[model samples]
Target: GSSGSSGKASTKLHVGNISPTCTNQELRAKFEEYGPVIECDIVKDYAFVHMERAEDAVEAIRGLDNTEFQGKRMHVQLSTSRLRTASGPSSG
Candidate 1:
């Protein structure tokens, strides 16, 4: 029933087209403007912000979609899928 992910402190958000220079603190600050940001991380120029609820994620996406950040246009969308886990024995 999409109750939420277990072992997940809260909902995990996926943000895209982020600038490489965007820091975790800055991302958190921007997201916190909308609501409480539990955690924020920028990976390979993409931003991920973990919030308490889906509504907060929606709000962030709506408010920041197609907006400019760090001189680049950013695309925001809700994370609609579960993270893929690696299965089987490790190759390495």
Candidate 2:
């Protein structure tokens, strides 16, 4: 066995295959369902969205992971970082 690991700054998500004509505010409002949002930037065919809590962002990821948006299927996942720790579950 190795050792314990720490994870942080996972409140952001990378949503790809977004509509090219998408807007920041529109995406923000859609993802704002889980929790508070930090910022939303729609980059042509992709998106940069941020949520306050780490869990919230993940929920949003699962909530609409493969949902179809304007054009293509929207893909949601943790942003580039050490957010791949898939720690255990929460309250049931």
Candidate 3:
């Protein structure tokens, strides 16, 4: 029942509209500008950030959603399965 972690660290962010120029370190640092992160992993042309706080994710959403980064609009959003939705594009 969504209680595996049951903490602020459970918040996950899925970032899409990623370009080839984006890297793990690059997005991680960009996200860090808004709030601390737990894990920042990038695969294919997408990225996922597990936040350190619920507010972290909220701040991130406000700070970077539709925000331009590395020639693309960062699709910062929440995930249900806690998995990478990297294979398909997410709708705003």
Q: Going through the candidates in order, what is the number of backbone clashes in each?
A: 0, 0, 0
| Winner of 1 and 2 under lDDT | 2
TM-score of each: 0.70, 0.74, 0.72
Task: For candidate 1, write residues 1-92 as lDDT tens digits.
Answer: 45353334356667788888888877788888888888788877577788887677778888978888778877877654657543456668
Please tell me which predicted candidate would have the highest lDDT against the true structure: 2
User: lDDT for every model?
Assistant: 0.75, 0.78, 0.76
Off by over 4 Å in 2: 1-10, 83-92
lDDT ranking, best first:
2, 3, 1
Residue pairs of candidate 1 with colliding backbone atoms: none
Count of clashing pairs, candidate 2: 0
Candidate 3: lDDT of 87?
Answer: 45
Q: The CA-based lDDT of model 3 is what? A: 0.76
Q: Candidate 1: where is the Cα deviation over 4 Å?
A: 1-9, 82-92
Clashing pairs in 3: none
Off by over 4 Å in 3: 1-9, 81-92
Which residue pairs come into collision in candidate 2? none
